[PDB]
Amino acid sequence: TVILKALVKACKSHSRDAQDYLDELKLAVAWDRVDIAKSEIFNGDVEWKSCDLEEVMTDALVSNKPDFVRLFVDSGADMAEFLTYGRLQQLYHSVSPKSLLFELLERKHEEGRLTLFSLHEVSRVLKDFLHDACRGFLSRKSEDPWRDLFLWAVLQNRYEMATYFWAMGREGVAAALAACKIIKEMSHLEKEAEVARTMREAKYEQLALDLFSECYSNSEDRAFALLVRRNHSWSRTTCLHLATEADAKAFFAHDGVQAFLTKIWWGDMATGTPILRLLGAFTCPALIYTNLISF
Amino acid sequence: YEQLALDLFSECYSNSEDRAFALLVRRNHSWSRTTCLHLATEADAKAFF
Amino acid sequence: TNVLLMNLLIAMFSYTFQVVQGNADMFWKFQRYHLIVEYHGRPALAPPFILLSHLSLVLKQVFPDPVDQKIITWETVQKENF
Amino acid sequence: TRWRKFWGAPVTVFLGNVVMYFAFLFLFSYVLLVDFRPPPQGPSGSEVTLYFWVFTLVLEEIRQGFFTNEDTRLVKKFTLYVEDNWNKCDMVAIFLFIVGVTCRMVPSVFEAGRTVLAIDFMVFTLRLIHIFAIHKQLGPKIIIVERMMKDVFFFLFFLSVWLVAYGVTTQALLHPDGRLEWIFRRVLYRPYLQ
Amino acid sequence: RMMKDVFFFLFFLSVWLVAYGVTTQALLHPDGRLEWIFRRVLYRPYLQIFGQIPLDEIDELVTFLLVTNVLLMNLLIAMFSYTFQVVQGNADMFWKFQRYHLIVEYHGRPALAPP
Amino acid sequence: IFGQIPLDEIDELVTFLLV
């Protein structure tokens, strides 16, 4: 701590530079005394620019140290502006072979090569996981950034960066359940026992159900409408479809969706209908005209 | 003591999950070359299993 | 002795029942959801008229952005709020 | 408009389906208890209307299973389908139904053409059991009871064998009977009746 | 409340018993008489359920059904037990209330006997 | 109540009673 403190004090005294303080931040990365880096480097007079911070941000994304990434995007970083397809290429290349993800990509690519770290291979595997979106397809700037990055984080089994990326995702819950299903599949395919259990210990669906409860407490009808939509980020598919794919019973167990089902269960005058009233309505076919029960 | 033993073992198994499956059956030099299992059985340290 | 063993078997059954009380209240709910979505699918015709309904279906086979945007905004807002 | 609202409503469709189902069941019961008399072709409602029923039921089931969502690989849909235990009971159901039809085609094997339908008839009862989960209260109880009964059914076999051995010992002690009928009788019915 | 509930279950249970009976009836014998047919379909099987098995009119996969029915009855009993527990709380207050109603009536009642 | 229902003097509703 005091080491870096003196380092940055001396750097500043000698000069105030984007590139000098850049190198100093690059030092602070591994130390990760962010509670000191923000104060010394950023609380100060010196102002930062997107390029330098964006290169070091690529570094930090490789670091899997989220807090710095948060501070950096707070530094006015436009990851939307940063994002390029080639960036995603190199990142997905930049993984440990220990990751069963790496072995899976390798085996998929090997099957492809025998038939006749590749974006096409990754899209193939992801489509094979969900088959609900076949999206897939360097200089070409790619839309929907945060979705893609969140997906990358979940694949790398890194939970914190995943949560942060969700924090500013456009879509409400759809991505969350997609992640639940994917990580369940990976855990089912996980090799190392303890690693498998740790994978199984994600609990995104908890976050999903919580957000849903929040929005329901407020709108209570617009929230209903929310559940039924099409999301272009996800091949315009319904959330309920995703719930089915993930088979996450817990989310369904939430009373809100239950009341929604109760509503659909009738189609007219749902909540107010005594069972005897329904039976009698079935008895004489003129009850609908009789106006015995609302409609 | 049994709690101390079980704690040590739980930790060193959570760490590697295979080196553990060596520590059990291996012979121990200090105690006249015997198996940890044999000592456990003799101890009737039911909680350990 | 056989009678006592049978009684203890029944006690085992009651124990297994009372032990599993938790998961059911949700699992049944999920089953109910599948049930409702299927019944919404079933055509209006009865089993004897199901053939007529299928024939009618084969015959029929032979024969926004602003609001959604507002909802997206509302949802993200709620997300920050929570 | 009011007519479309009343009829199109999903719950009403289910109610009517339950009514027609119970009527199916009782009518088939009566038709079997009556048309059992003539070995030859038989009354029209007995066979023709029955075939219409079972064909329509199989058609609805297969359509719901295969053409609901998308024209995906048949193997995936089949693997999903066969996984369900209710799907299993329906499969043994169709097996028993076709076996009963084939035996009813047989006039010489009258005992067979009767026993197959007899054993078969419990199928519709079983399905009606599962088709009552809609209401709030007993639903969860039935659901949990399913699994509990599976686990317990795994257990019964041992105690049954125990009772059998007890009966065997007592019978071989009491009256120390080459007739196989009376032997099996004193071996099985006497202990169960006790 | 428990009995207000069990009325529904008693329907499915009865129907299952009737199905077992009808199976056994079409199993044992070869009758046009409506009263006799309904009898041999409903009364004789319920009689076999309570220990009245007339083998002289039945004997010239039942064991599995019998043990399954025994288990099902046990599960019904376990249902009743599981339902019994929760009620005690609200029962306390409700009974308390009923007591007041009864007492205020009884004080309202006159002295003379019903005769 | 102990399972002795002598229908010889009883047969020349009750199911609800039993349940």
Side-chain angles (χ1 to χ4, degrees), chain A residues 1-3 6-8 10-11 13 15 17-20 22-23 25 27-30 37 39 41-42 44 46-51 53-54 56-63 65-66 68-77 80-84 86 88-97 99-102 104-105 107-109 112 118-120 122-131 133-137 139 142 144-146 148-155 157 159 162-167 169 171-183 185-187 189 193 195-196 198 202 204-205 208 210-213 215-217 219 221 223-228 230-235 237-246 248 250-268 270-272 274 280-282 285-286 289, chain B residues 1-2 5 7-14 16 18-43 45-49, chain C residues 8 11-12 16 22 24 27-28 30-38 40-44 46-48 58 64-69 71-74 76-82, chain D residues 1 3 7-14 16-18 21 23-25 28-29 32 38-40 42-43 45-48 50 53-54 56 63 65-68 72 75 79-82 85-86 89-90 92-93 98 100 102 107 110 112-113 115-118 120-123 125 133 135 139-140 154-155 159-162 164-165 167 170 172-173 176-178 191, chain E residues 9 13-16 18-19 21 24 26-27 30 32 45 51 54 58-59 62-63 67 75 78-79 83 89 91 94-95 97-105 107-111 113-115, chain F residues 3 6 10-11 14-15 19:
Chain A
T1 75
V2 291
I3 292 165
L7 297 165
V8 306
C11 180
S13 159
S15 66
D17 171 26
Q19 209 276 349
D20 287 9
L22 178 157
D23 183 17
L25 284 181
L27 324 173
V29 187
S39 45
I41 293 94
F42 299 104
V46 57
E47 164 193 339
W48 287 96
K49 197 43 192 187
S50 45
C51 320
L53 66 84
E54 83 190 2
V56 66
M57 273 189 75
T58 73
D59 296 293
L61 303 191
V62 192
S63 85
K65 296 193 183 178
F68 274 94
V69 185
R70 158 193 317 283
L71 268 295
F72 298 159
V73 296
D74 294 331
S75 74
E81 186 40 54
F82 153 79
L83 184 139
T84 62
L88 274 297
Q89 309 170 336
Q90 66 214 4
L91 279 169
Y92 272 88
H93 292 69
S94 59
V95 296
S96 175
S99 91
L100 56 86
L101 176 149
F102 188 77
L104 286 156
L105 285 172
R107 281 132 54 203
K108 178 68 176 204
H109 186 109
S118 174
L119 312 161
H120 167 274
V122 196
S123 177
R124 287 297 190 78
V125 189
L126 299 204
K127 172 180 172 181
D128 299 352
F129 284 183
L130 293 182
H131 202 298
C134 301
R135 193 275 310 167
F137 46 90
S139 87
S142 309
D144 207 20
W146 295 68
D148 300 329
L149 261 299
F150 168 97
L151 186 45
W152 172 92
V154 162
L155 264 295
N157 195 15
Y159 172 89
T163 65
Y164 182 88
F165 282 12
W166 170 38
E171 283 76 4
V173 308
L177 290 203
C180 299
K181 164 63 168 40
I182 301 183
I183 204 181
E185 174 174 17
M186 257 180 65
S187 44
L189 271 296
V195 171
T198 45
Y204 295 125
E205 56 280 11
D210 176 277
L211 167 74
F212 190 81
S213 56
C215 71
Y216 175 87
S217 87
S219 284
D221 68 341
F224 276 37
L226 158 59
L227 176 54
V228 55
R230 307 162 177 181
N231 298 148
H232 304 287
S233 72
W234 293 117
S235 56
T237 52
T238 79
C239 271
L240 295 169
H241 192 71
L242 267 185
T244 299
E245 320 306 323
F251 161 78
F252 271 115
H254 193 296
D255 58 299
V257 67
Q258 280 286 22
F260 166 89
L261 289 183
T262 290
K263 186 66 45 205
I264 194 64
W265 175 246
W266 306 74
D268 279 299
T271 303
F282 174 61
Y289 323 95
Chain B
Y1 293 147
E2 209 191 354
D7 292 324
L8 177 67
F9 166 84
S10 70
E11 194 279 329
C12 55
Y13 155 85
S14 176
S16 173
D18 171 79
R19 300 183 184 273
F21 288 159
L23 170 62
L24 275 301
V25 68
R26 180 207 88 172
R27 304 177 73 93
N28 289 284
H29 302 265
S30 92
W31 308 92
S32 57
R33 304 212 172 179
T34 44
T35 82
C36 283
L37 282 180
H38 162 65
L39 280 199
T41 49
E42 211 164 272
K46 186 217 70 51
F48 175 46
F49 289 118
Chain C
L8 266 290
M12 180 277 290
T16 306
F27 194 80
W28 163 91
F30 182 60
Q31 195 43 282
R32 154 163 176 173
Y33 159 75
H34 282 280
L35 199 73
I36 296 157
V37 61
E38 173 154 12
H40 171 283
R42 289 194 296 272
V58 176
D65 296 333
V67 192
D68 158 79
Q69 186 44 248
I71 308 165
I72 295 170
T73 57
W74 185 73
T76 43
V77 163
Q78 274 292 336
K79 168 164 54 172
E80 289 106 8
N81 307 337
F82 177 80
Chain D
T1 65
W3 169 90
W7 275 24
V11 55
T12 71
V13 189
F14 158 86
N17 190 356
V18 170
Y21 187 86
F24 169 82
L25 186 46
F28 172 39
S29 65
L32 178 47
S46 58
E47 174 53 40
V48 171
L50 185 149
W53 282 109
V54 286
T56 46
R63 182 217 50 78
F66 280 64
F67 312 92
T68 302
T72 324
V75 194
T79 47
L80 173 62
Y81 173 76
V82 304
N85 294 25
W86 304 116
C89 86
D90 300 311
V92 67
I98 188 53
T102 318
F110 186 75
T115 179
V116 63
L117 276 302
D120 195 358
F121 204 95
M122 190 156 310
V123 162
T125 80
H135 78 281
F154 180 73
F155 162 98
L159 268 295
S160 46
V161 179
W162 180 267
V164 160
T170 42
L173 200 44
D177 199 309
Chain E
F9 196 105
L13 194 44
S14 63
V15 182
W16 153 248
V18 160
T24 42
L27 174 139
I58 305 168
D59 196 2
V62 310
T63 43
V67 308
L75 267 292
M79 178 277 289
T83 306
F94 276 36
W95 180 97
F97 186 77
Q98 297 305 333
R99 164 148 172 178
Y100 167 97
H101 260 302
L102 190 44
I103 287 182
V104 57
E105 165 182 357
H107 179 280
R109 310 196 271 212
Chain F
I10 297 165
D11 204 9
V14 310
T15 74
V19 308

